[PDB]
Amino acid sequence: LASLMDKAYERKLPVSSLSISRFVDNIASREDLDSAEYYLYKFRHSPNCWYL
RNA sequence: AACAUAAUUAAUUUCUAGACAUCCGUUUAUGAGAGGAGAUAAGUCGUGUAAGCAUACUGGAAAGUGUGCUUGGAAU
Ligand SMILES: [Mg+2]
C-alpha cells in the first residue's frame, strides 16, 4: 500500500480515502505508526484531504 | 501522442512529442574582351550615267552593276 500512495504523489495524482483508511487499519507495530504518521501528513497535503 | 485518478464538500492529472535541417532555382551588380552611337572641329582625296524603293553580287567600302517596282524626273 505504501508503494501505491508514493506513486500517486510522484505523479501528482489524487489518493483515495479508502487507501489511507486501509493503511491505518493494518498497522501492526510501533514502527508502523511512524510510517502511517508520515502518510497521514501526505494525505492532508493532497487534493482529497477533506475526505479523511 | 491524447490515458487514467477520483467521487457522502469536490477536484486532480491529462490537454503530447516529433520536424523544418533548408532549398532547388531566381534576380541585381563588380566586367577581362569587342563594338555601336555622340560631343569637341580644323583636317583627308574625291565628288554630268534622272532619282528613289526592295533585293543580290562586287566594291577597303560615298559606290558600281543586274532584276522588278514607283514619279516624289524629263518627255510632241
Ligand atoms: Mg538598292
Name every residue whose Cβ is closer than 8 Å to that of residue A38 and which is 6 or more positions away in sequence: none
Angstrom resolution of this structure: 3.1
Look-up: residue for cell 477533506? A50
Q: Is residue A12 left, alpha or beta, with left meaning phi > 0 and alpha meaning psi from -120 to 50?
A: left
Q: How many CA atoms lie within 13 A of A51 on its CB side?
A: 12
Cell of residue A39, nine digits: 502518510
Query: By the 8 A CB rule, do A48 and A14 touch?
Result: yes
CA/C1' separation A27–B74 (Å)? 146
What phi and psi values does residue A26 have, to the nearest 5 degrees? Answer: -95, 25
Burial per residue of A12-24, b for 16 or more beta-carbon CB atoms within 10 angstroms, e otherwise: eeebeeebbeebe
A12: nearest nucleotide, CA–C1' criterion: B13
